[PDB]
Swiss-Prot record, chains A, B:
Tissue expression remark: Highly expressed in roots and at lower levels in leaves and siliques. Expressed in seedlings, cotyledons, roots (e.g. root hairs, epidermis and cortex cells), stems, leaves (e.g. vascular bundles and hydathodes), and siliques. Expressed in root phloem.
Knockout or disruption consequences: Impaired glutamate-triggered (and Ala, Asn, Cys, Gly, Ser-triggered) membrane depolarization and calcium rise. Slight reduction of photosynthetic yield of Photosystem II. Overproduction and aberrant placement of lateral root primordia.
Name of this protein: Glutamate receptor 3.4
Family membership: Belongs to the glutamate-gated ion channel (TC 1.A.10.1) family.
Induction (UniProt): The induction by glutamate, gamma-amino butiric acid (GABA), malate, aspartate, acetate, wounding, touch, and cold stress stimuli is abscisic acid (ABA)-independent, but calcium-dependent. Cold-mediated induction is rapid but transient.
Localization terms from the record: Cell membrane; Plastid, Chloroplast membrane
Residues glycosylated per entry: 39
Subunit structure of this chain's protein: Forms a heteromeric channel with GLR3.2.
Function of the molecule: Glutamate-gated receptor that probably acts as a non-selective cation channel, at least in hypocotyls. Can be triggered by Asn, Ser, Gly and, to a lower extent, Ala, Cys and Glu. May be involved in light-signal transduction and calcium homeostasis via the regulation of calcium influx into cells. Plays an important role in the calcium-based fast transmission of environmental stress. Acts as a negative regulator of lateral root initiation and development. May restrict primordia numbers and position along the root axis by a signaling process originating in the phloem.
Length: 51, 51
């Protein structure tokens, strides 16, 4: 399936297929991102879908 | 008077009394501030009312 949270697929270890986290720094009056962690690359500044 | 845009007062040169500008950097998906210019100090990182 392809849901509202992107593609969903379960491999042989029952995780989701491609997890990724958006590193937020809280310094202003709003949560700004400062990059993105992915399973594939890890600590990118681009969106993790381009990799 | 004290309006919605703070205090308002006109000196002998017909300006407003204390002008100040919020330097915006446009790098994310939103305009973040990176400091504040004031007449009083000029290029502070604190709000210009504290000075
Ligand atoms: C998370 O990333 C890891 C590392 O790239 C991947 O898991 C490995 O994938 C390779 C190729 O598919 C396999 O040969 C390894 O045996 C895998 N290792 C482990 C520990 O699973 C995979 O791309 C991602 N895994 C998940 C569950 O998202
Ligand atoms: C903007 O800041 C300037 C500089 O601090 C000030 O203007 C001077 O103020 C002093 C003291 O009040 C006077 O002696 C000078 O004659 C002023 N100079 C000029 C060119 O006006 C003042 O604090 C602020 N002026 C305005 C219009 O906001």
């Amino acid at each position: 399936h392809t849901g509202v949270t992107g593609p969903i697929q379960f491999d042989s270890d029952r995780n989701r297929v491609n997890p990724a986290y958006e590193v937020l720094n809280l310094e202003g009056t709003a949560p700004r991102t400062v990059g993105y962690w992915s399973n594939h690359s890890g600590l990118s500044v681009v969106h993790p879908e381009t990799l």
